[PDB]
Amino acid sequence: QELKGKYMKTPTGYLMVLRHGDNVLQNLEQLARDEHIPSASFVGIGFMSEATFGFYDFGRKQFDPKTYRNVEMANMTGSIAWKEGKPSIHAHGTVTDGTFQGAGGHLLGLTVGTGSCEITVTVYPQRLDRFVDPEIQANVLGLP
Amino acid sequence: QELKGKYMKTPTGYLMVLRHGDNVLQNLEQLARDEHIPSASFVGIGFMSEATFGFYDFGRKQFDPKTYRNVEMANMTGSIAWKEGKPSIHAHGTVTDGTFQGAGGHLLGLTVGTGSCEITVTVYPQRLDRFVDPEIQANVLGLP
Amino acid sequence: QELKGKYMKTPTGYLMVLRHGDNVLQNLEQLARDEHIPSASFVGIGFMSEATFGFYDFGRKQFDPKTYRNVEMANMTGSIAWKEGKPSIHAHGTVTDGTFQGAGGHLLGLTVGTGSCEITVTVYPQRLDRFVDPEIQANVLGLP
């Protein structure tokens, strides 16, 4: 019942409308599990109480993080796939505040604020996993 | 005849190409009315003579606005729905100038400059309204 | 064989996953030629070893360019069409670095770094050309 009222089936996939306090990537993980999404693309917009990005450091194998608060999310773009049996969301975003200046990159997590988040999901029939590309030491989406 | 030559039907919705001087959100409103769009998602790009954003102030119930001139629109992302019988466009954007620095957020209005605006519209069969969410005092897209 | 393993057919078009060292717009040109794409929209994300943008100068008929290195591409949005028999890609992007500040605009070229690039392509049945709009001295996508 977690996702009750938070999405609708569309001809090409789903439309999701998340609400105050919803954890965006976790709700996309739950959609993947509830609807058994083989793989998907998505885009979205909304208003976030917090958005955390990471810039990956290959040397020390860690994301350097940064958190923004009470920001408009001008765009999110990403994919749904799987890794080790669990949903594996890969999302980027662009956020702006009352200066209107943009920031963002690779999303680690984000939470809807006093607003909503509209997400347009295009679902594919192929079950896709992500794997570590040994040439670069990063996760990449595998295609058939 | 307003929209003559400005869009084509696609398998999933429409593709719109707006031209010098066109008011982007107003042309999306007109597409909604002319094609009786129940609801839709969209993304787009273009070059704007002006783009006006707003950062909403919940205390005084007003957007603080900011206008940018002669800017590339690196992305727009949004939705078409209805409110009180009229089209209700919810759009965000990201704009850049000759410094290449990004800015944007919630769009209040924008006008195509010496360029064009390409808009990819995905149309859904469900008629959707936006409503004020009393928990947050903001418009949210209602789903069935 | 250039594009072997780099894309899959989807119900609405293609999904492309480009890899370290791939030239993004050139690979989209090659997809257009290999799959005889009449026209298309796309969005994408990835990590770029370099991304070059241009801000067009109408007076001297040239793009002023700027190159960013080792950047996350928070979004790309664009279209595939044709001009003089050759693919004509029109793409914008938004990139961020370890400051998380955003930059971008009109893309002249970009190369995948130690990462990948996921591209969601929506294909239309209509063959579209771009043409110079004599009122503005810029290329615009022509519609039927």
Q: Kindly list the residues of chain A whose beta carbon comes within 8 Å of any beta carbon in chain B.
A: 5-8, 10-12, 15, 17, 19-20, 43-45, 47, 72-76, 94, 96-98, 100-102, 114-116, 118, 120
Cα–Cα dist C75/B77, whole Å: 11
CA-CA distances (angstroms) from residue A54 to A23, A81, A90, B82, C136? 17, 20, 12, 37, 41
Size of interface A-C (CB pairs under 8 A): 100
* Residue C85 structure tokens: 């028999």
Q: Which of C77, C95, C119 is the best residue to mutate to test the B interface, defined by the most B CB atoms within 10 Å of its own CB? A: C77
Are the C-beta atoms of residues B113 and B98 closer than 8 Å to each other?
no
Smallest CA-to-CA distance from B23 within B44, B51, B1 is with B51
- How far apart, in whole angstroms, are the C-alpha atoms of residue C101 and residue C99? 5
State how far the Cα of B68 lies from the Cα of B45, in Å rounded to an integer: 15
Non-local (6+) Cβ contacts of C9 within 8 A are none
Q: Retrieve residue A98's tokens.
A: 């009352």
Q: What are the CA-CA distances from residue A59 to residues A56, A105, C69 (Å)?
A: 9, 19, 17
Residue A51 near residue A93 (C-beta atoms within 8 A): yes
Q: Could you tell me if B130 and B88 are in contact, meaning their C-beta atoms sit under 8 angstroms apart?
A: yes
DSSP one-letter code for B138: E
Kindly report the nearest CA distance between residue A55 and chain C, in angstroms: 6
With 0-12 / 13-18 / 19 or more C-beta atoms within 10 angstroms meaning exposed / middle / buried, residue A99 is exposed
Q: List chains adjacent to chain B, taking adjacency as at least 3 C-beta pairs closer than 8 Å.
A: A, C
Q: Where are the strands (E) in chain A, listed by range? A: 7-10, 13-19, 39-57, 62-83, 86-96, 102-124, 130-133, 138-141
Distance CA C90, CA A93 (A): 21
Q: Quick one: tokens of A97?
A: 């505040």
* Interchain contact, C102 vs A104, CB within 8 Å: yes
Are residues C30 and C80 in contact, defined by beta-carbon separation less than 8 angstroms?
no
Which method was used?
X-ray
Residue type, C124: Y
Q: Specify whether the backbone of C134 is left (phi greater than 0), alpha (psi in -120 to 50) or beta.
A: alpha
Contacts of B140 in chain A (CB under 8 A): 17, 19, 115-116
- The one-letter amino acid code at C133 reads D
Q: What is the DSSP letter of C12?
A: T
Structure tokens at A118: 């509209």
Query: Is A96 within 8 Å of B126 when comparing Cβ atoms?
Result: no
At A13, list the tokens: 């996939």
DSSP secondary structure letter of residue B100: -
- Please tell me the distance from the alpha carbon of residue B105 to that of residue A101, in angstroms, as a whole number: 9
| Interchain proximity C92–B73, CB inside 8 Å | yes
Nearest CB to A140: which of C10, C17, C44? C17
Q: CB-hemisphere CA count at 13 Å for A103?
A: 24
Residues in chain B: 144
Q: What are phi and psi of C33, to 5 degrees?
A: -70, -40
Nearest to B98 among C64, C94, C101 (CB): C64
Both tokens of C65, joined, read 């360019």
Judge contact between C24 and C45, C-beta under 8 A: no
Residues 6+ apart with CB under 8 A from B72: B46, B47, B48, B95, B96, B97, C55, C92, C105, C106
CA distance B93 to B7: 21
Resolution to one decimal, Å: 1.3
Which chains share 3+ C-beta pairs under 8 angstroms with A?
A: B, C
| DSSP run (H or E) holding B16 | strand B13-19
Neighbours of C48 (CB within 10 A): 24
In angstroms, the first-to-last Cα distance of chain B is 33
Dist. CA B71–CA B73, nearest whole Å? 6
Q: CA B127, CA A15: separation in Å to the nearest integer?
A: 13
Closest-approach residue (CA) in chain C for B95: C105
State both tokens at B107: 């769009």
Among the listed residues A42, C134, A30, the one whose alpha carbon sits nearest the alpha carbon of residue B20: C134
Q: Cα(B91)–Cα(A75) distance, rounded to whole angstroms? A: 10
Rounded-to-integer distance, Cα A92 and Cα C102, Å? 12
State the smallest CA–CA distance between residue C95 and chain B in angstroms: 9
- What is the largest distance, in Å, between two alpha-carbon atoms of chain A? 44
Q: Do C102 and B98 touch (CB under 8 A)?
A: no
Q: Do C12 and B12 touch (CB under 8 A)?
A: yes
Kindly determine whether residue A120 and residue B125, on different chains, have CB atoms separated by under 8 Å. Answer: no
Q: Which domain holds residue B28?
A: 1-144
Q: Which residue of A has its CA nearest to C9?
A: A124
Task: With beta carbons less than 8 A apart as the criterion, state whether A38 and A123 touch.
Answer: yes
Q: Which residue has the tokens 């919803």?
A: A22
Q: CB neighbours (10 Å) of residue C42?
A: 24
- Please report where in the chains the tokens 């954007």 appear, as a residue: B93
- Give C41's contacts in chain B (Cβ within 8 Å): 15, 43, 118, 120
**Are B39 and B130 within 8 A, CB to CB?**
no
Taking chain C, what is the end-to-end CA distance rounded to the nearest angstrom? Answer: 33
Output Rg (C-alpha) for chain A, integer angstroms. 15
Distance in angstroms (rounded) separating the CA atoms of residues B112 and B116: 6
Q: How far apart are CA C140 and CA C126, in angstroms?
A: 16
What span, in angstroms and rounded, lies between the C-alpha atoms of A74 and B92? 5
**Does the distance separating the beta carbons of B72 and C55 come in below 8 Å?**
yes
Rounded to whole angstroms, the Cα distance separating A66 from A124 reads 32
User: For residue A88, what is the domain's CATH number?
Assistant: 3.30.1330.80
Q: How far is CA A37 from the centre of its chain?
A: 14
Radius of gyration of chain B (CA): 15
CA atoms within 13 A on the CB side of A107: 28
Tell me how close the Cα of C81 comes to any Cα of chain A, in angstroms.
Answer: 22
Which chain B residues have a beta carbon less than 8 Å from that of A20?
Answer: 133, 135-136
For chain B, percent helix, then strand, then coil, each to nearest 5?
Answer: 10, 65, 25
Is B74 in contact with C58 (Cβ distance < 8 A)? no
Overall domain count for chain C: 1
Q: Give dist(CA C1, CA A47) in Å, integer.
A: 44
Q: Which residues of B touch C66 (CB under 8 A)?
A: 100
Element (H, E) at C27: helix C24-34
Cα–Cα nearest to A51, from A13, A22, A81, A8: A22
